[PDB]
Write a protein that binds this DNA or RNA. Sequence first.
RNA 1: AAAGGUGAAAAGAACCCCGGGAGGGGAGUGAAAGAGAACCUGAAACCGUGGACUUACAAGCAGUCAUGGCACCUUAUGCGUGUUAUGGCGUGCCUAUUGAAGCAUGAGCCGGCGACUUAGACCUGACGUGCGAGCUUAAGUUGAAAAACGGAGGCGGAGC
RNA 2: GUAGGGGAGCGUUCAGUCCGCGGAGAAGCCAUACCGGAAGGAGUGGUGGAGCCGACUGAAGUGCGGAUGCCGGCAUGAGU
Lengths: 194, 94, 94, 130, 117
Amino acid sequence: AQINVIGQNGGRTIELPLPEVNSGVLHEVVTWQLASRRRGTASTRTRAQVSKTGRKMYGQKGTGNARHGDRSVPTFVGGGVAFGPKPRSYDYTLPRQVRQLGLAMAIASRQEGGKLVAVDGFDIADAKTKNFISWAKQNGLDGTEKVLLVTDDENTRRAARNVSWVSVLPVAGVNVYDILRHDRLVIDAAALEI
Amino acid sequence: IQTGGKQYRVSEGDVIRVESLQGEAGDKVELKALFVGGEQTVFGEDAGKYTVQAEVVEHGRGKKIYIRKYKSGVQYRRRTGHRQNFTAIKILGI
Amino acid sequence: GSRKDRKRVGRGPGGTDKTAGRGHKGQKSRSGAGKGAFFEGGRSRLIARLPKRGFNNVGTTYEVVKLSQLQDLEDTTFDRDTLEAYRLVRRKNR
Amino acid sequence: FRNKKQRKQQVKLRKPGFAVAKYVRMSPRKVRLVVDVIRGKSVQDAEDLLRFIPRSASEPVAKVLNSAKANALHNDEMLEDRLFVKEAYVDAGPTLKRLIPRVPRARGSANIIKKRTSHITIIVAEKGNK
Amino acid sequence: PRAKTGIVRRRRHKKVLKRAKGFWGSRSKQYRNAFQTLLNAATYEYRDRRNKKRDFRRLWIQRINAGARLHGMNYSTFINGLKRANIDLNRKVLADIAAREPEAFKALVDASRNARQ
RNA sequence: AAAGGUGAAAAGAACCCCGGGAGGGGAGUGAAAGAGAACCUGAAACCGUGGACUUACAAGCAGUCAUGGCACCUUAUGCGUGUUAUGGCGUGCCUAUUGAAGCAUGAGCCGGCGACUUAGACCUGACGUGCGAGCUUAAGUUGAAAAACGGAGGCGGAGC
RNA sequence: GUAGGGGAGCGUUCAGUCCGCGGAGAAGCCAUACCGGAAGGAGUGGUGGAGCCGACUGAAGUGCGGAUGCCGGCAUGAGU
Ligand SMILES: [Mg+2]
Ligand SMILES: [Mg+2]
Ligand SMILES: [Mg+2]
Ligand SMILES: [Mg+2]
Ligand SMILES: [Mg+2]
Ligand SMILES: [Mg+2]
């Protein structure tokens, strides 16, 4: 049951997830997300093989006081590493129902406090970034909070550029992290809304 | 002093293991064992005829000690901290 | 707020680190440490010495449709091969 | 006082009677032996015993005993008739290394040490008690 | 990512080292030798801690029987006569009572005599 | 093969003093020369200098306990800290072992390097989540400060 | 209480979020008689000359006395 900026009422649609605001699922989801974005790149010459050394050394008996095969082994200095990082992935498939349930539960997790929907993104008048500050101020946003603006209308979002007030996630590119991480969610376009 | 007082100490604040009931000077009394006071020394069972009194001073926690244990060749080393609690009784009584 | 975001309460346990433990030098004592050869099957232990041949075929296999499903509930929707797709009998291949 | 930053600029931090010979190719252990008799005596006497003492180490210790008295007199406006060795001492130093030898275990046991200085020093001061 | 052993081993070793004071030579200076000394040090600490109570037990007895023998009893006799009087649970630290206070221990000796014959 | 670091800026130290020099001591510059070119911090082994309490009839894994002496009072006048004299007690660590102070292994000392991982639509268990008589997708496609789409297939669903 | 199984935890690096601190001085380094059941963590002091605690979650090249282990430095034998 949430109120739009310009025009009618709605949000009596969309029963919000049960039980209400489970943080466990949230956790599973975001963790899955940062693990998705995680880019494996690993510089290790782990193997005795990967660093360069000619391999026969001195002698197995009778030299006294050492017993080494090669100059490239892990127990040497400069050799390979025992069990070093390699280029893995850790990108998996999260069960879909928990993605849905996730961002739903996120939007819901904004129901215990401030969230906002909007119509008429024409109040910007090109962009100018200032008219966005106006729109925010008269909509109650002084940018003392952190704000995730979700909208279509390239001109309307292009108005908001800063890491201070806001951040922009267009055409319903909604990301559970991206919302839960910001202070206020401004849902604007009612498209993926309702 | 086995646990809990005895004997003769004239006008002295001292220490003892925890006193049960807490108090700031909640009064604690003790039946006797021996007395050298008055320059007349009479032994026990005549000390049931006497009782010293004491005021509880403060509830303390003693100086930290470590508990270290070792057995050789077997590994087995052990480190744990210990402080054994007390209360301080000020002694003036009959 | 992600700061406040908590764990699943028992999803993750920590792993197993065999560095330290002080009296951890893992696995056995002797004899069958260091190897990659363990391998729980193998030749003459009661697998061979076991007297079977039989004959392998494994031909046509039919999809089982219980009467118990069809009667009782739903509509008697006049099944054919059509509805089976949506009736939760959808598997195919057979 | 103020703070440490200010203590650094409010005071230049001098060194009375102090001079030191760095990097003299000699052995600390050795030079110690000379330097011991010098220590705590009349700076003149010190110059004499230093004149007649047969270790070659004694020479750069002598060259220094003066340079410190030198500093003591000129730089610190001190009074040479009250002058004496307050302290002197030998601190080792950067043991000398050449390009070679480099080889494992082949005719490999030899010195090539050519040990470090001992650094010398000798702080000088005025008698006090008289 | 890689986490070197930096700044960890050193704090640890200094912690070990610091217990060592009147520790003679490398015992107070080199790590391994110090830590190692602190193993046997563990043994003697704990065990001789339980022991010190045996030690003071010994001392006090050694005094009490002394005062006793001085007055004509002995520890066997004196403590016998003491216990023989339900009177004295005196027991603990009675030594100092014998050491500092002559006439008191004379009265305890005489009394314990009554409780014998 | 090892390999790096003045300073914000060379302002990189005229000039004086000891010396053949090296090297240092002043001066000056500089926030700093507690940065001076063997130029960021500067640990530990190891070498010295000064002080405190101590030691030249004492059998010793170097400690531990207990009391006394001397000295010091910035978590700190005691619940003390440092050192020490005497008493009591007291068979290094590790591995390997029926059994280790071992006259059995290892190791001069300190620093740093240094060993139970990783991969697969594998298998089987414990816990946890989501849906639940149903549960999932794979390659890929499309977006890509973002994720959605993708039912080819897999597992339940009947045993012999 | 040894191999072995089970439970709670301490510390280090990177990462996201939160609170923040720093030239009237960061980390590191040095001394210390305090706290904590232990891994440990604070307080003040001394160095230092730029950066860095704490909380919550996540990921490890994550914890050394030994391997006649590796590199380096410095001892002994000895002023022999
Ligand atoms: Mg073994
Ligand atoms: Mg065996
Ligand atoms: Mg430097
Ligand atoms: Mg070991
Ligand atoms: Mg010889
Ligand atoms: Mg000879």
